[PDB]
Amino acid sequence: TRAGCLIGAEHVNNSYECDIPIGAGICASYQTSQSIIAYTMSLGAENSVAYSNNSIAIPTNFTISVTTEILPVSMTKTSVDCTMYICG
Amino acid sequence: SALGKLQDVVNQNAQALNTLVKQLSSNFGAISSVLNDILSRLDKVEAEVQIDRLITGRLQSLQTYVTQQLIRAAEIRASANLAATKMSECVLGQSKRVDFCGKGYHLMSFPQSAPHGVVFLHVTYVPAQEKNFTTAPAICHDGKAHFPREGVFVSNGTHWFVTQRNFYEPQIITTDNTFVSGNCDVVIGIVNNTVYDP
Amino acid sequence: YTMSLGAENSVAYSNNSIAIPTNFTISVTTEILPVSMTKTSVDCTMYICGDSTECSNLLLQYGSFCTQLNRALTGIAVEQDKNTQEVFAQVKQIYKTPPIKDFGGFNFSQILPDPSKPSKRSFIEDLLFNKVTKFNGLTVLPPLLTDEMIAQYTSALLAGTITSGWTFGAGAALQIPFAMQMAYRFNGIGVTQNVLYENQKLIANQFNSAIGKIQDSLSSTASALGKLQDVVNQNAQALNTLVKQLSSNFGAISSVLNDILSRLDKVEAEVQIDRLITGRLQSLQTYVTQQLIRAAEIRASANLAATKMSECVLGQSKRVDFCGKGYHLMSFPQSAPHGVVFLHVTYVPAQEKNFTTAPAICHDGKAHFPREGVFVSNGTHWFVTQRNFYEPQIITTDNTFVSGNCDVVIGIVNNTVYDP
Amino acid sequence: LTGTGVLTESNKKFLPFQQFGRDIADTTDAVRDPQTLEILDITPCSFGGV
Numbered sequence: 240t241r242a243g244c245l246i247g248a249e250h251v252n253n254s255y256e257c258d259i260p261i262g263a264g265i266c267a268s269y270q271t272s273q274s275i276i277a278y279t280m281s282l283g284a285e286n287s288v289a290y291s292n293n294s295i296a297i298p299t300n301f302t303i304s305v306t307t308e309i310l311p312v313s314m315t316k317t318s319v320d321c322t323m324y325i326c327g
Numbered sequence: 328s329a330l331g332k333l334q335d336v337v338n339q340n341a342q343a344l345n346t347l348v349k350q351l352s353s354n355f356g357a358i359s360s361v362l363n364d365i366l367s368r369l370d371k372v373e374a375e376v377q378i379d380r381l382i383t384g385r386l387q388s389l390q391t392y393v394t395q396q397l398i399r400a401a402e403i404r405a406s407a408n409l410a411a412t413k414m415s416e417c418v419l420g421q422s423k424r425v426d427f428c429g430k431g432y433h434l435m436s437f438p439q440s441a442p443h444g445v446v447f448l449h450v451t452y453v454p455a456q457e458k459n460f461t462t463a464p465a466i467c468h469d470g471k472a473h474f475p476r477e478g479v480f481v482s483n484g485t486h487w488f489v490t491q492r493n494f495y496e497p498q499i500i501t502t503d504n505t506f507v508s509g510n511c512d513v514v515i516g517i518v519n520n521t522v523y524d525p
Numbered sequence: 526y527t528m529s530l531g532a533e534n535s536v537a538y539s540n541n542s543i544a545i546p547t548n549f550t551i552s553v554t555t556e557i558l559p560v561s562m563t564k565t566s567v568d569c570t571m572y573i574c575g576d577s578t579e580c581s582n583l584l585l586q587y588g589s590f591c592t593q594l595n596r597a598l599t600g601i602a603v604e605q606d607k608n609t610q611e612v613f614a615q616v617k618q619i620y621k622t623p624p625i626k627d628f629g630g631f632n633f634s635q636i637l638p639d640p641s642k643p644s645k646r647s648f649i650e651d652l653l654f655n656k657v658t659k660f661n662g663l664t665v666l667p668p669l670l671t672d673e674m675i676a677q678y679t680s681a682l683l684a685g686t687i688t689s690g691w692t693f694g695a696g697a698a699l700q701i702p703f704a705m706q707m708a709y710r711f712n713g714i715g716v717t718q719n720v721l722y723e724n725q726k727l728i729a730n731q732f733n734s735a736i737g738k739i740q741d742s743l744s745s746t747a748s749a750l751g752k753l754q755d756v757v758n759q760n761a762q763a764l765n766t767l768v769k770q771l772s773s774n775f776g777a778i779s780s781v782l783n784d785i786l787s788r789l790d791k792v793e794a795e796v797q798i799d800r801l802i803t804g805r806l807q808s809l810q811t812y813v814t815q816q817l818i819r820a821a822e823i824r825a826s827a828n829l830a831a832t833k834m835s836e837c838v839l840g841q842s843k844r845v846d847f848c849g850k851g852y853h854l855m856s857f858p859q860s861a862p863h864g865v866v867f868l869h870v871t872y873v874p875a876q877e878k879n880f881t882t883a884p885a886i887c888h889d890g891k892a893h894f895p896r897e898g899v900f901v902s903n904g905t906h907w908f909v910t911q912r913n914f915y916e917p918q919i920i921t922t923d924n925t926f927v928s929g930n931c932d933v934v935i936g937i938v939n940n941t942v943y944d945p
Numbered sequence: 946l947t948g949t950g951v952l953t954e955s956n957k958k959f960l961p962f963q964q965f966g967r968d969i970a971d972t973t974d975a976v977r978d979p980q981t982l983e984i985l986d987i988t989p990c991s992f993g994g995v
């Protein structure tokens with residue numbers, strides 16, 4: 240690979256979602272008779288939007304989705320006695 | 328792996344403390360790591376060099392620990408400022424910022440307490456079922472170009488309607504829903520359709 | 526000389542004068558924001574004790590300093606990868622532009638990829654990539670997302686923006702003509718959508734001219750992409766200092782370990798080896814500290830760039846001076862070496878005129894206030910028009926609402942109110 | 946001189962009096978054989994994390 244020599248993984252020509260990041264666009268995964276494979280990570284499915292000068296898409300329904308998000312606020316306080324640590 | 332952002336900070340602090348407490352077992356070039364073993368095997372003129380080496384090593388370790396703690400505290404302060412901004416905007420109000428209060432049209436958020444952190448419950452609005460419709464930028468009835476006030480002109484194949492953007496609620500194109508501005512030959516794509524009068 | 530802060534402009538302010546613009550100029554400005562930097566993984570043992578056994582044996586007496594020095598660089602690399610993922614990879618479905626380019630007259634061929642070249646990048650991206658241009662344990666790790674993947678992400682974002690407006694960020698991509706998208710953009714900044722439909726060719730020509738002027742730049746000047754070249758030069762200078770600190774003596778008789786082990790015995794060269802180890806360890810600590818500070822700066826810049834990508838590109842932000850100077854309409858991302866370039870499309874008035882204004886109008890003892898507009902007078906008659914554009918209309922009952930009497934508003938003037 | 950590396954045939958045409966060459970950052974990267982007077986590059990041996 241362009242990131243280094245990889246031993247123990249079978250390089251496949253298919254494209255899947257990146258599971259274990261290796262580098263240079265190559266990721267590894269444990270799939271199918273069953274061994275570690277290496278492949279070029281795909282960024283997503285190709286969706287060609289049906290765009291024209293007289294077509295529009297308006298939704299007729301909706302789904303109230305509630306998602307979670309975690310943000311750190313504080314950490315543990317540390318007051319190390321310098322003299323007792325150096326000259327206990 | 329859902330609460331990994333807090334467990335990561337906890338593990339980083341624990342590893343820093345473990346490294347700081349294990350650096351005492353190092354020699355830093357001295358004959359021993361225990362000061363009692365050095366003061367009991369050398370005189371008061373040769374053990375000073377070993378004590379100085381140990382002091383220099385432990386002081387360098389403390390300086391590295393304090394620098395790492397300052398960098399981590401700066402990161403935690405940035406995260407806490409972000410969390411306070413989100414608590415002020417998403418929770419205490421309705422933010423129109425895209426992808427800030429979660430993915431989708433944000434409605435409201437609920438705070439939740441977490442160990443050394445905060446958890447937000449962003450309630451968003453996501454469309455689910457869309458359909459295709461033929462649209463037109465304007466409508467001319469008597470040589471007068473009509474534009475939607477708050478909505479978009481759509482056609483289901485035979486008739487034309489005016490409806491909101493984020494939801495399909497077709498209504499009859501009336502004078503109260505559209506405003507007149509200009510003539511027909513100035514707008515590109517304007518189609519002919521009747522405009523109801525209440 | 527003493528620097529001047531600018532020209533003195535005394536605004537002609539009074540209690541009855543207002544300036545409403547009669548024209549506008551679609552100005553597109555560029556902005557460069559760093560995203561990531563080059564990964565560095567320096568071998569802590571080989572840098573201090575390159576091809577030496579006694580040095581490696583003596584280095585073990587300093588504890589796990591090498592372990593934490595390597596862990597810091599590994600964390601920096603993971604952080605740069607996370608920043609690169611968070612800035613660009615924001616859509617879970619790659620979008621492709623249709624083969625027809627009937628975007629209401631707007632020309633996007635200068636920002637869309639061209640299949641006539643191996644590197645699937647646009648012309649502006651090619652111009653950007655043409656500007657910003659292993660030993661002693663120093664190893665450079667390649668990034669996870671290559672330039673082709675960043676270009677594909679940028680192309681998907683641009684296609685979603687030009688074919689679905691801002692609906693591709695909140696959910697499924699809903700197709701919409703670009704003229705209607707620009708009408709919605711105008712309605713967002715407080716301008717009636719008729720101004721766009723009545724001046725579509727002019728706005729398209731202004732956008733094309735702005736993109737052409739942007740193409741004129743970034744090819745002759747060199748201080749445009751200085752924010753990325755600065756980071757590149759800082760990393761290069763840090764690496765050069767780290768690799769040149771090996772030639773120092775730090776009080777030893779020589780800087781080469783082989784020259785010391787071949788001129789002294791195994792009991793006197795230990796002091797010189799210890800001095801060299803201490804000096805090189807201090808150098809590595811200073812380098813790691815500087816790299817951590819620079820990584821914090823780059824992470825802040827990457828968070829800002831991701832916020833801008835989420836707001837200006839995937840939506841219309843009403844924040845002043847955030848998505849460029851002026852009333853923001855839309856933005857287009859562009860790939861850059863270790864960074865991102867935003868092309869903010871703004872709305873700037875061009876030609877304003879003076880008009881006599883009044884806060885209210887009384888017709889039958891009832892004070893009238895504009896619903897969405899401002900009362901203006903051209904000297905003889907009074908009209909009601911929007912704020913960001915001069916479109917005078919007859920004051921009617923459908924354009925004004927009644928509230929209170931005349932003697933309560935300060936500055937109310939007499940004028941007739943039409944009845945439909 | 947001393948060191949460790951693979952000696953590949955280079956193309957850097959030295960001067961008739963110059964013996965060894967140094968790239969940027971003062972690193973020995975090319976030496977001339979004192980017998981056949983040919984020039985060759987000094988590439989460090991392969992290394993990296995596992």
Ligand SMILES: *[C@@H]1O[C@H](CO)[C@@H](O[C@@H]2O[C@H](CO)[C@@H](O[C@@H]3O[C@H](CO)[C@@H](O)[C@H](O)[C@@H]3O)[C@H](O)[C@H]2NC(C)=O)[C@H](O)[C@H]1NC(C)=O
Nearest residue numbers: 463466467468469470471510511512516517518519520521
């Ligand atoms: C929407 O309605 C208007 C008027 O109701 C339509 O305009 C009309 O278009 C027809 C067909 O071109 C015109 O007839 C021809 O006009 C030319 C002059 O342009 C004349 O030389 C021919 O002999 C023939 O009469 C008609 O004059 C014109 N009327 C007006 C008032 O402009 C328009 O075509 C309709 N839109 C669509 C999409 O059909």
Ligand SMILES: *[C@@H]1O[C@H](CO)[C@@H](O[C@@H]2O[C@H](CO)[C@@H](O[C@@H]3O[C@H](CO)[C@@H](O)[C@H](O)[C@@H]3O)[C@H](O)[C@H]2NC(C)=O)[C@H](O)[C@H]1NC(C)=O
Nearest residue numbers: 883886887888889890891930931932936937938939940941
């Ligand atoms: C706008 O129109 C109103 C009424 O159409 C004007 O109010 C009128 O102002 C005149 C001038 O002061 C008043 O005439 C005088 O009124 C006083 C009592 O305040 C009286 O003692 C005098 O003999 C004389 O008649 C008039 O009464 C008054 N009308 C009403 C209904 O209030 C107003 O002046 C107009 N605005 C401007 C800027 O001129």
Ligand SMILES: *[C@@H]1O[C@H](CO)[C@@H](O[C@@H]2O[C@H](CO)[C@@H](O)[C@H](O)[C@H]2NC(C)=O)[C@H](O)[C@H]1NC(C)=O
Nearest residue numbers: 298299300301302303453454455456457458495
């Ligand atoms: C909008 O979507 C909701 C959610 O899918 C639909 O509600 C479902 O409707 C089906 C049809 O009868 C029921 O079998 C389900 O039990 C409903 N689910 C819930 C949670 O109520 C709704 O019908 C859709 N509306 C339209 C107009 O399509």
Ligand SMILES: *[C@@H]1O[C@H](CO)[C@@H](O[C@@H]2O[C@H](CO)[C@@H](O)[C@H](O)[C@H]2NC(C)=O)[C@H](O)[C@H]1NC(C)=O
Nearest residue numbers: 460481482483484485486487488489497498499
């Ligand atoms: C487009 O919408 C119009 C308005 O609803 C449809 O017209 C109605 O169609 C129903 C079903 O055939 C009839 O029962 C009504 O009498 C119609 N109303 C009028 C005023 O014509 C029309 O059929 C729709 N067209 C398509 C192709 O869906």
Ligand SMILES: *[C@@H]1O[C@H](CO)[C@@H](O[C@@H]2O[C@H](CO)[C@@H](O)[C@H](O)[C@H]2NC(C)=O)[C@H](O)[C@H]1NC(C)=O
Nearest residue numbers: 291292293462463464515516517518625627629
């Ligand atoms: C949308 O684009 C299509 C494709 O160009 C337009 O269709 C052409 O319209 C012109 C002008 O009326 C005709 O001369 C061509 O013969 C049409 N070609 C085809 C293949 O239909 C269409 O008019 C455009 N619509 C709008 C509203 O701009």
Ligand SMILES: *[C@@H]1O[C@H](CO)[C@@H](O[C@@H]2O[C@H](CO)[C@@H](O)[C@H](O)[C@H]2NC(C)=O)[C@H](O)[C@H]1NC(C)=O
Nearest residue numbers: 547548549550726727728729730731734875876
């Ligand atoms: C608004 O400003 C634009 C841009 O300056 C004007 O467009 C120019 O008009 C002049 C006069 O006819 C032409 O010579 C130029 O070629 C036009 N430029 C472009 C890019 O089209 C426009 O006329 C102005 N409108 C008003 C009402 O003043």
Ligand SMILES: *[C@@H]1O[C@H](CO)[C@@H](O[C@@H]2O[C@H](CO)[C@@H](O)[C@H](O)[C@H]2NC(C)=O)[C@H](O)[C@H]1NC(C)=O
Nearest residue numbers: 626627628630631632633634635648733736737
């Ligand atoms: C969009 O702009 C590009 C470049 O400004 C146009 O491409 C030019 O097309 C003309 C027409 O023959 C050529 O003479 C030029 O050599 C082209 N320039 C480049 C750089 O390719 C393109 O035609 C424009 N698109 C539209 C629809 O007008």
Ligand SMILES: *[C@@H]1O[C@H](CO)[C@@H](O[C@@H]2O[C@H](CO)[C@@H](O)[C@H](O)[C@H]2NC(C)=O)[C@H](O)[C@H]1NC(C)=O
Nearest residue numbers: 880901902903904905906907908916917918919
């Ligand atoms: C203020 O605006 C009004 C309305 O546009 C002007 O009144 C028109 O003036 C033109 C030019 O003299 C005449 O041809 C129209 O008949 C007038 N219309 C009406 C209803 O009076 C007025 O002249 C403008 N005043 C100034 C000073 O510019």
Ligand SMILES: *[C@@H]1O[C@H](CO)[C@@H](O[C@@H]2O[C@H](CO)[C@@H](O)[C@H](O)[C@H]2NC(C)=O)[C@H](O)[C@H]1NC(C)=O
Nearest residue numbers: 538539540541542882883884934935936937938
């Ligand atoms: C705007 O300010 C001017 C300046 O004070 C005002 O003009 C004065 O108005 C008072 C009250 O009508 C008169 O007594 C003065 O004689 C006026 N002075 C001059 C120099 O004209 C004017 O009325 C103010 N307009 C508004 C709407 O507040």
Ligand SMILES: *[C@@H]1O[C@H](CO)[C@@H](O[C@@H]2O[C@H](CO)[C@@H](O)[C@H](O)[C@H]2NC(C)=O)[C@H](O)[C@H]1NC(C)=O
Nearest residue numbers: 960961962963964977978979980981982983984
């Ligand atoms: C050093 O000695 C070697 C061998 O004795 C010389 O190499 C010979 O060079 C001549 C002329 O270039 C060739 O014809 C021979 O074939 C070479 N022999 C071998 C074994 O390579 C070399 O030129 C001498 N160098 C100096 C500076 O005198």
Ligand SMILES: *[C@@H]1O[C@H](CO)[C@@H](O)[C@H](O)[C@H]1NC(C)=O
Nearest residue numbers: 249250251252253276277278
């Ligand atoms: C992948 O493609 C290469 C080049 O076409 C081919 O040689 C190789 O056999 C392919 N591998 C698989 C598993 O199809």
Ligand SMILES: *[C@@H]1O[C@H](CO)[C@@H](O)[C@H](O)[C@H]1NC(C)=O
Nearest residue numbers: 288289296456457458459460
């Ligand atoms: C709208 O058109 C596209 C392309 O023709 C199609 O894929 C899509 O299913 C259509 N929408 C609906 C609701 O059928």
Ligand SMILES: *[C@@H]1O[C@H](CO)[C@@H](O)[C@H](O)[C@H]1NC(C)=O
Nearest residue numbers: 536537544876877878879880
């Ligand atoms: C408005 O008045 C000011 C002050 O007299 C003047 O400088 C300016 O040119 C006027 N505006 C126009 C459009 O003439």
